Amino acid sequence: PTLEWFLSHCHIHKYPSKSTLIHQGEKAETLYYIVKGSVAVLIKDEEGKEMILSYLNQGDFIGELGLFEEGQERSAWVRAKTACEVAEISYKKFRQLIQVNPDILMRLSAQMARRLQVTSEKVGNLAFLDVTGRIAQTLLNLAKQPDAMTHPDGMQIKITRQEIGQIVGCSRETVGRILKMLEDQNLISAHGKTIVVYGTR
DNA sequence: TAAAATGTGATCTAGATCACATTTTAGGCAAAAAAGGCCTTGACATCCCACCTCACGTATGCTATAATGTGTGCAGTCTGACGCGGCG
Numbered sequence: 671p672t673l674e675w676f677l678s679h680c681h682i683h684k685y686p687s688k689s690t691l692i693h694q695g696e697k698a699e700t701l702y703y704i705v706k707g708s709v710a711v712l713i714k715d716e717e718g719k720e721m722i723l724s725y726l727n728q729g730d731f732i733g734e735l736g737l738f739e740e741g742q743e744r745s746a747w748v749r750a751k752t753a754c755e756v757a758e759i760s761y762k763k764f765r766q767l768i769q770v771n772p773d774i775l776m777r778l779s780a781q782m783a784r785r786l787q788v789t790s791e792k793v794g795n796l797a798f799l800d801v802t803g804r805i806a807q808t809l810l811n812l813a814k815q816p817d818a819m820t821h822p823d824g825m826q827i828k829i830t831r832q833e834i835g836q837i838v839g840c841s842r843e844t845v846g847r848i849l850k851m852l853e854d855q856n857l858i859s860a861h862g863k864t865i866v867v868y869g870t871r
Numbered sequence: 872t873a874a875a876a877t878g879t880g881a882t883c884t885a886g887a888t889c890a891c892a893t894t895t896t897a898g899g900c901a902a903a904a905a906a907g908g909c910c911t912t913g914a915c916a917t918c919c920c921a922c923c924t925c926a927c928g929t930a931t932g933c934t935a936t937a938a939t940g941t942g943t944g945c946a947g948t949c950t951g952a953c954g955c956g957g958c959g
């Protein structure tokens with residue numbers, strides 16, 4: 671259907687894991703699409719500490735904020751959650767096929783609207799809640815993300831203390847201690863990498 | 872000038888620090904073994920085949936008082952023109 675006509679035009683590259691997608695500040699000259707896999711968008715500070723922006727699954731056009739004004743840059747890092755086949759688009763051609771077909775910026779209305787909605791409650795939560803609420807609702811939303819697997823009492827997922835410390839804006843063993851308290855509160859099971867939340871659905 | 876904004880500062884309060892030992896656990900590399908894919912075996916079940924197989928059916932033969940030329944149930948006749956064979 672629609673997607674067939676647009677993949678008919680695209681140029682593709684295969685991405686290994688562990689590496690960089692976007693380099694912040696450089697010339698933004700291409701839009702991409704997640705052909706297969708998952709990715710983690712994030713950003714550094716002056717000191718170099720990472721702080722995660724989000725994860726992203728299938729159904730995502732990628733590297734879009736540079737599409738629009740002449741002479742823009744990359745406003746964030748994007749790092750490998752997994753190995754990912756990824757597409758290629760130029761911007762003059764973006765003018766061409768937005769003009770002869772308006773459904774792609776209808777799609778990008780979809781995705782970008784989701785992204786500043788989810789970001790709207792990212793910052794909205796970033797003001798007020800406490801670390802309990804931060805990591806709690808974090809792992810709720812990751813329980814909504816399809817990367818988690820089904821456990822017969824809920825949802826299981828595999829992650830370390832460091833990266834969730836880079837989610838909620840605090841240190842890793844802090845979330846370790848309140849995590850073990852949360853175990854003692856009987857709302858999770860937890861063996862090392864593999865953690866599980868019940869109460870889903 | 873009504874009504875919202877602006878200083879008192881001492882007394883606190885949930886997380887970050889910070890070097891180093893110990894887990895784990897990947898993830899991914901070598902693989903043991905089991906369960907399909909490959910074949911076989913024994914055992915069964917059902918036949919196809921045909922090979923027979925007797926009962927019932929069927930092809931054929933005579934019957935010696937004597938008897939000896941149909942018909943047989945119909946048609947109802949339409950009619951005007953054209954060929955042809957007699958017909959003088």
Ligand SMILES: Nc1ncnc2c1ncn2[C@@H]1O[C@@H]2COP(=O)(O)O[C@H]2[C@H]1O
Pocket residue numbers: 692698711723724732733734735736737743744745746747748785786789
């Ligand atoms: N708040 C956000 N939500 C989703 N994606 C983002 C956000 N900020 C940056 N990005 C992505 O990170 C990319 C970095 O380079 P760009 O600015 O060209 O395009 C950006 C987006 O694709």
